[PDB]
Design a protein around this ligand. Sequence first.
Ligand code: HEM
Ligand code: HEM
Ligand SMILES: C[C@H](O)[C@H](O)[C@H]1CNC2=NC(N)=NC(=O)C2=N1
Ligand SMILES: C[C@H](O)[C@H](O)[C@H]1CNC2=NC(N)=NC(=O)C2=N1
Ligand SMILES: N=C(NO)NCCC[C@H](N)C(=O)O
Ligand SMILES: N=C(NO)NCCC[C@H](N)C(=O)O
Ligand SMILES: [Zn+2]
Lengths: 420, 420
Amino acid sequence: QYVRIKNWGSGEILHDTLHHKATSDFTCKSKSCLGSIMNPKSLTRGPRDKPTPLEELLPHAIEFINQYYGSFKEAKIEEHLARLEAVTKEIETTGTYQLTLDELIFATKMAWRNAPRCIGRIQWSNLQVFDARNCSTAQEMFQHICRHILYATNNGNIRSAITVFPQRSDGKHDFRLWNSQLIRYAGYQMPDGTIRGDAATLEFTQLCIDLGWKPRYGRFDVLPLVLQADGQDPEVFEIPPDLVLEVTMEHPKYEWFQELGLKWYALPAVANMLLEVGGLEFPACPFNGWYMGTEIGVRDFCDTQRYNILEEVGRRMGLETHTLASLWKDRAVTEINVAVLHSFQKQNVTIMDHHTASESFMKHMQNEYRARGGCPADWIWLVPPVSGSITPVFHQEMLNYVLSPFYYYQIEPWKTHIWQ
Amino acid sequence: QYVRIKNWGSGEILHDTLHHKATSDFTCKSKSCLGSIMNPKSLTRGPRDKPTPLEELLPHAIEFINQYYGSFKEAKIEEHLARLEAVTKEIETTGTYQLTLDELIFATKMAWRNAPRCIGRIQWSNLQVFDARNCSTAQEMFQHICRHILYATNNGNIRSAITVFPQRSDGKHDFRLWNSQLIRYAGYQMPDGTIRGDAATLEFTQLCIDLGWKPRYGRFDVLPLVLQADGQDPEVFEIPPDLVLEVTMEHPKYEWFQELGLKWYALPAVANMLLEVGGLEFPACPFNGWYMGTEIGVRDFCDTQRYNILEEVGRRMGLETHTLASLWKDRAVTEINVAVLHSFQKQNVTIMDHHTASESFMKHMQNEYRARGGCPADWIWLVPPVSGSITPVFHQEMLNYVLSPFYYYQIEPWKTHIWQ
Ligand code: HEM
Ligand code: HEM
Ligand SMILES: C[C@H](O)[C@H](O)[C@H]1CNC2=NC(N)=NC(=O)C2=N1
Ligand SMILES: C[C@H](O)[C@H](O)[C@H]1CNC2=NC(N)=NC(=O)C2=N1
Ligand SMILES: N=C(NO)NCCC[C@H](N)C(=O)O
Ligand SMILES: N=C(NO)NCCC[C@H](N)C(=O)O
Ligand SMILES: [Zn+2]
């Protein structure tokens, strides 16, 4: 009937009905839970060689139209009926169909609403949609991407936005951004055995090199857009520095902090995901909301596989660096987080601390259960990388499932690409 | 064939073969992940009215004996064969069977090894086993429990231990400890609308009252053992104060910290779980290892549903208590954690910080994959309530599954008890 969910903090109880509408199989099995897996197939939508089977497309298309029309307060029945007819007619005449701008907007918001790994979902109804469904060249993609970066940025006062490129036709003409995110730093395997910049973008930095990119050998070298249009070989495009807004890090107390020469871009823009809606798939639809301090302060700066600044941030604080039990890492990371927050707040760049975000998400959950009887949620991703139980989301039991529309991962393009 | 697992910190990859031996269905479904659920049925072993069906018992029994005998370096084949025969003969003659002390020891260690929610598992081969399988009265249980508390405590130098009471016969003669843990503080719904002590033990404190316990109305009132033997009504037994070792909290800097009048018992002893092994079940088998600072500092002291000391610990630190973004909670909790650590370390009471534990568990995982091709792990429980990504376990993908022997939860006794 429904799954009983409890919040161990408030004692409140919710009943999940929404999970019943879940698509197909998920990450876990009958005798195992694999909720810990980063990139499971259930969260991935791969390549294709042929168009989508009509028998599969049609039902999916009708389901979406019924969802879309059952959305407004006083349902426009005559239009609802008319759209169902027009979409079917389009499918049997063209082998596919086009969404109305309105439906796209609904789709991108609902897919965001359906992102189980996003804590910012209370903002789901505030999203700018850029319709680049008529794009055809790499140069045009690059232009659309620039307009996105410029709009989203809004000179620090971040605005959530997404740009949709042409939907996958037969799978051999896919528009793809080879970048992880719109703005990302390079990583170099320097001569002295070390690694400069962002070690996460190592393999991709080389790819950019092999494609003729000019390695600036540094720590914060904004990588170039690697765009593939209409299935052609990817073209390298350098991002105009004027567009890339960064925030130099400075502690409100430790004046020695800026001597680290640390900064980070103000724009969190996922670039390699796929939007699935009503049987259609858009393999190129970069999007962004705003940052949560912990992503930068904790993950980007402190991960062993990323910048790895903990060792020296502890030293410069005078902490017992060679004694784990002293909890130095705990003291450092906290200061790096207030620095990140402080910095953004000083330079007027929108940001959100993990505590405030968790509280708003909790309110979002409540609004959601009351509204549609559920909220797909991935606890492992929703709970901040620090201050776990200090956060309200930690004490909230949740169900994780894939609905539709949805935002899927994709197989890295260089692994499946055709080199002509 | 096997599930591929990766550690995003080191880049290392492991192959899980162990999950194939998993018992039955787990928490999650085919289209949903419920790994976030605290007390799912898959982790619970309920009551019974009749003995265990022979057809079920026998295979389980044989599987365990084969596991046990396939354990020593140079297998004692003749004895292996002989035990298989003797156990079958015992099952068909008595309707059940008894484990040898050796098998019990192996069973309790393996079950611990199989606890997916325990980060301390590198210590799995160091465990004292108290055989109280011949116990028959509530008074005898109480005595055994006292000997356990005394041994485990060892005057601060904690030793892992478990005491096994009589196995479930027909299910109407169960030995059960109604307490959550051996040592636990009372919670009172005081006159002025507040709540004193440990709010988690509220409903149970009243139960103790209804049974004639003398409410001492305080904050750290060690609750009484509520023991049910041979299926009879539970008898109240007050724990001898001399046995209950506590640690008064004091910060190595903030001398005003002890003015809070804070302390906590040094003995983490789970009292209400059930041991399942070779088809048998022991519904009474309290156990303990040692504490991880975060359990006390973060959960016990800082949870909204527990002590809830954050508000004033922040105040006394001078932090911006009415501004979430200031990250005060982060600064406070860290100090409470070093206090807890410091205190235990000063009073010579064994304890472990979350960073050191995570590193040892990681080593345990490695030893385990190489040894038996896997390690059941619940990421959601294994990752500390603070410092998530600062910890190595956060970056380690893991599989969660139920093996055998195992430690199961049970339905709270007062909900199913027969009152004669
Ligand atoms: C309004 C501000 C928003 C905030 C603060 C926010 C915050 C976050 C955070 C903390 C994550 C985790 C990132 C990581 O750990 O790598 C995340 C993930 C995600 N967010 Fe949001 N988000 C916001 C807006 C959006 C928007 C506009 C969309 C899409 C329309 C979105 C889609 C997603 C998706 C699909 C993921 C998963 C990414 C992945 O799996 O790698 N978010 N978001
Ligand atoms: C040697 C020191 C040990 C340490 C530091 C350790 C630590 C921990 C921690 C942090 C938890 C989580 C507790 C909570 O969040 O409520 C836990 C859970 C658990 N541990 Fe260990 N442990 C140790 C020894 C043992 C032993 C001796 C056993 C059993 C023989 C054991 C069995 C378990 C089980 C089954 C759980 C799950 C409890 C539950 O689900 O509520 N541990 N342990
Ligand atoms: C192994 C484990 O799945 C990864 O380390 C996780 C855990 N949870 C996470 N949560 C979030 N928000 N981002 C992550 O990258 C992330 N990675
Ligand atoms: C809702 C969620 O399952 C609970 O808040 C969790 C999460 N992880 C946890 N981890 C540990 N170690 N102990 C817990 O009680 C705990 N509870
Ligand atoms: N807040 C968002 N989206 O709105 N984050 C998207 C992923 C960004 C990534 N975690 C980073 O730190 O770069
Ligand atoms: N470390 C252990 N076991 O060895 N903990 C068991 C649970 C104790 C519980 N988390 C508490 O803080 O009281
Ligand atoms: Zn699962």
